[PDB]
Amino acid sequence: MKFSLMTYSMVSLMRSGEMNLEDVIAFAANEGFDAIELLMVNFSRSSDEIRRMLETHQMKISCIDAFVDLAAQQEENFLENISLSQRIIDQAVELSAPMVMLVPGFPDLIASEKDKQQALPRIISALQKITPYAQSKGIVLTIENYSALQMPFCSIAEVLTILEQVPGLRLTLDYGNMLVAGEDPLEAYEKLRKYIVNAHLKDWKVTSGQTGTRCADGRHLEPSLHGQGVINFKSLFAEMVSNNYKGYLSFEYEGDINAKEAVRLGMMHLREQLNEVI
Amino acid sequence: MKFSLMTYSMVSLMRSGEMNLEDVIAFAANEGFDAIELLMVNFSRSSDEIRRMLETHQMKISCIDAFVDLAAQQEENFLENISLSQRIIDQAVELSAPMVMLVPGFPDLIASEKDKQQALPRIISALQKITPYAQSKGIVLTIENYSALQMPFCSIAEVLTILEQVPGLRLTLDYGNMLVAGEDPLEAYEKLRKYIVNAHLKDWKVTSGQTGTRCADGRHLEPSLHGQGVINFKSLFAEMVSNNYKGYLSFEYEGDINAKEAVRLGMMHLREQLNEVI
Ligand SMILES: [Mn+2]
Ligand SMILES: [Mn+2]
């Protein structure tokens, strides 16, 4: 039951220039994380440089995350996105990360029911091409269940449909995203357990006005510090220990509290809950 | 002073299957719009049937909108995104749309201040290749000022810096997005007037909790029906009339009110304000 810190959780401070990637790695080390989950949106940093930072701070990468448009209808773009996915797998090899997580589409690019219906077999086809490459390189490929419901990979049923058609594909369960999709997060873990090799932990609190995140049941949702919202982390941890889960628990925070403070506060809660289970 | 309906404003009902594209075109005609502004996320609709729908309902396309990653760091992907942009221009020719609007990056793909700095010259170089192609096809190419501030095309200064480096490039001014960026919308119009060939009209109201849109000055923002928020549309209309603006005013709504109701309500307000000017 090791914890990893998503670099995406620190994106506010990376965007302001207050933290660079090495600062995020050093902060993860200082806060007792076993790994980082590295969001990769370009290859501008050399592998040598990242490896140096990891060695300096005695840190590992548990998983590399990327957004890739595997729903692309244009053949040349679709093919280049499969190629980009293979480049990401190569980066995992170079950086000793055991796993990749792809978000295989973009919500603004699905603008109708027909678009969603067409995106699904396209995404499946792409993953059927990418996963064998990942396997040949010794890398575990996952997708994440998402929060924008026009994407055909949010509900338990949607993610199961993909996983059952892509040999060897695994799942990063974003526990909080399941709430947005109208699912019970614990039931999602139970139904998808055999596929779950990685997990994202984030929390939500209910609001009165629009947020750009409304779950299927109508409740307005705002990112919450972990333990201050509605997600029951202890029940998940109890089931995971019961089932001898061996993956990482990745800290995700998408809110507006200072990112370092949010990590310190939320990890206090998550560690307390895990200790109650252990 | 003509009005166009963004098909994006109807995206909720297209995603739910309640409206198809022809329904949006017929709705626009029934509500007295001169045109639609068509969001194009794929080429799956046949040009012949779109043209048929437009003739049936006596409607036009004022502008085609698309999202393309012109900041892509990987050369193969970047070149294919230039090619995709040229294909979008070809669709504008096939559909008799006189104008294209590109959103030239994706906010989740800019994860640091360094990424923003590197993205800007990349986007400019792409637009320097795409704009002569548009010119060769008689199409006016625009970008839109955006709302996620990690993208180097949100402030007045950022948009002006791009426009002044790309001969013939023009601007779709999203009046509400300027408010997100901490600018005065009317001042944005005044400073960018010579480039503005299309405009998006949307409104915002002020809220207390997290929304995924925080204005640069700290106010949390919620999509508003036009006239119920803080954007002064009459001042803009007065200046556009004084300057004899010849483009379209495009109706944008990103909120959760039923999309047909939102069009009817917001257009009542906007037409009243325009009538007060004339
Ligand atoms: Mn996640
Ligand atoms: Mn707009």
Side-chain angles (χ1 to χ4, degrees), chain A residues 144 174 200 202 252:
Chain A
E144 176 186 29
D174 186 307
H200 291 179
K202 76 199 183 196
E252 191 171 341

Side-chain angles (χ1 to χ4, degrees), chain A residues 102-113:
Chain A
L102 302 180
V103 178
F106 288 85
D108 288 339
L109 307 183
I110 296 296
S112 72
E113 188 79 85

